[model samples]
Structures are given as structure tokens and as C-alpha cells.
Target: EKIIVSACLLGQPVRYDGQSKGIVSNWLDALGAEGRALAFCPEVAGGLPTPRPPAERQGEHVVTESGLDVTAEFDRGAELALGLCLAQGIRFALLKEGSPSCGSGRIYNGRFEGVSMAGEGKTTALLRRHGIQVFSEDQLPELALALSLV
Candidate 1:
């Protein structure tokens, strides 16, 4: 069982703000304990640097708060992430919610007004469209209860 997890979730400082978004979870820890985990940052992998201006997915174009076009980067990152999953036979992912690159169940509504709506991240959408199971980080508690492999 291979898993594609957000690098930030694994304690990497890959968030747009150059800070790690970490959540302590024995369930997620278990994924790495037995060598079943792979972590990645689609935004970074697509060429975005840390401490970048916050961005949100808007239709097919991803824009920063200052309205920089990042659609190409996001798309590239998704392709790279998908490639990694396919090469590794990964079928599941644990992504960060509300992220343009990794969100699962919701994302900012592109108003930069702290408004969020139902949507999937760029990478998450691609992964799920290709038949991979994706989960938001907050859903770990429920997943842990259902997974016996842990």
C-alpha cells in the first residue's frame, strides 16, 4: 500500500508561507513506520518557491493574491505528482485541505476574502480523476479507525 502525502504534512517546510503545516497523528505516522509513504509538494515540484504569495485556484487559472498567473506551474506540478504516483503504483493520497495544489474537499473561492467553497486541489483533482483515493489531512482520524493496516 503506497501513499502520496503532502510534504507539509510530513513536516516539510513546503507551504506557500515557508512554514510547515503539521498535525500530530499516529495514524499518519504509521504510514511511514513500515515504509509505505511518499511525500511531495506539487507547488514546489512545479517550480514555486517557499514563502510565496498565497494563491487560489480559480476555474482553470490559479492566481496569487496579487493576481499573478500560476496556472502553468500548478498544472505542471499536477502532472509531475501524477507521474510519481503512477511510477510508484500509488493509489491513495493524503493532502492538505484548502490548498490550491493539494486541497481535497474545499479551496478558497478566489476572492482572497477568506471565503472557501467545495473544490479539489489541482493535484488532488488530477489524482482522483485518475482513480486514486484522496483524503484531506483532517480526515485522518476517521481513516485511521477504518484502516486495519495501521
Candidate 2:
């Protein structure tokens, strides 16, 4: 099966800080070699630029620390991600954790105080809502196992 991957995790500098969270992973390399890895960045696909202001989900809105509402962009990004999944028939996603767009299982507390809460990000929620399994970077091993069972 093909896998949807976070572009930054694939060594792309597409983060809000213009940095990459690339990691060394045999499973990811194997997927890439098999041509089963599809890289996507929801924030960038939403039309946000690199090094943009960091934002977090607060209640029902996504806002930057300096008070800019980016909920529309976030929503559009999530939709685009879902559209990609549907078009490609992707069933799994390897995404960046603790991000405003890709976080799975836990996310920032919206205060930017280095605190976390038990919640999924916009993209994760949207993908999961459509039956796509979303995995964080920390779950690479688990992702490998899941992939093998199919």
C-alpha cells in the first residue's frame, strides 16, 4: 500500500520555522525505494509561506501568537489533504506530531507555552474522519508493523 508522508519528515524544509524534522528511518527509506511514499505539507499546500508565524488551535479557531486568524487556511489545507487521499486512495499517513495541521493524539495547548493537550490536529482529524489512519513520526516502528500486516 502507498503511504502519505509529511514533507518535512521526508527532509523538506517546510516547517513554520523553515526547518526540517527529517529523521533516519529504515521503514521510510524502504517505502521511498518502493515508490510508496507520497509527501505532502498541509500548511504549505494551504498557501502559507515558510517561516510563517506559528499558530495553534484555540477553541474553534486557529490563530497566530501575534493575533492573526488563519483558520481558513488551516481548513483549506485539511480539505486539500483529504482530497489528495481520496484521489490517491491512500489509507495511511505519516505526519508530523504536535503541529497545528498534522498533530495526532496530542497537540499544543494553544498558549504556545510548551504545554500539550490530548487532541488531534486539523489534518489528522479530517483524515481520520474519512477512515485514513494517521501516524506521527514517533510511530514509525508501529507504522512499519501495520504496513506489514496488510
Candidate 3:
């Protein structure tokens, strides 16, 4: 089955810095080359601009300094991504870490004091709740093996 991936990881210019990270490894590159991955950036897909201010997780939610509760946007992105995955029969996803909208296990606590907490971001939580296996970029290897068996 195919996997959903964060666009920034695939060199899309959709990061908060306006520049994509473009940190493609051999395995990720292989997936892309094989056309087994669908790439997306929730922030950009939700109409947020590149070079935009960073956001953070506040308690159980995601928000920006402008007091924008982007949870709805994140949900919308997740819904869109899930629709694509379902149409393609995909069951896995590789998401960016440390993102307020995509973090799978840890994210900034909205304090900007360098604090991180264990939680799923708005998109990740929504995806996981719907039974789509979500993996952070850092967990790609394990996810690869797991997906291989499924």
C-alpha cells in the first residue's frame, strides 16, 4: 500500500521558514521514486503562508500567537489527506515531527520556552483516531518494517 508523507520532507517549499527541509534519506527517496507516497503539508494545505510564525500546542490544542485555534484547519487537512489515502487504499503516514499540526509524539508546549510534551498534534490525533497508522519522520525505519508486514 502507499503511504502519506509530509511534503516538506520531499522538498516542497512549504515550511514555516518558507524553505523546505528537503531532508530526504535513501528509503524516503526510494519511496518517492517508486511512487508509493503521497506528500502533503497541513500548514500550507490549510492556507497558512510560508515563512509564517511558528505555532505550538497549548494543553490539548494547537494555536498561534494571534490566538488562532488552528485545530479546525488541522482537522480539515487531516480529512483531506484521509480522503486521498482512502481512495488509494493507503494505511500508513509519515509526518513531520515537532510540528504543532503534525507532530506525532512530541510538540512545543506553546510556551516557546523550549518545552516539549507527549501528545499527538491536531492532524496526527485525528488520523490515528481513525485507525490510520501515523509515524514521525524519525520513526520511518520502524514504520517501514511494520508496513511491510501489513
Best by TM-score: 2
The candidate that wins on lDDT is 2
lDDT of 3 by residue, 83-102 (tens): 77788888888988878877
- CA RMSD (A), model 2: 1.0
Q: Give per-model TM-scores.
A: 0.93, 0.96, 0.90
- RMSD from true fold, candidate 1: 1.8
Clashes of 3: 0
Q: How well is each residue in 1-150 modelled by candidate 1, as lDDT tens digits?
A: 678889999999989878898889886787789787788999999998887899988898999988899999899999998999999988778899999889989999989999999998899999999988788888886555544454
Model 3 clashing residue pairs (backbone): none
Minimum summed lDDT over a 10-residue window in model 3 is located at 70-79
Question: What residue pairs clash in candidate 2, if any at all?
Answer: none
Structural RMSD, model 3: 1.6
Against the true structure, what is every candidate's RMSD?
A: 1.8, 1.0, 1.6
Q: Backbone clashes per model, in order? A: 0, 0, 0
Q: Which of the two candidates, 1 or 3, achieves a greater TM-score against the reference?
A: 1
Pick the winner on lDDT between candidates 2 and 3.
2
Error of model 2, residue 108, in angstroms: 0.8
lDDT per model vs. reference: 0.87, 0.91, 0.81
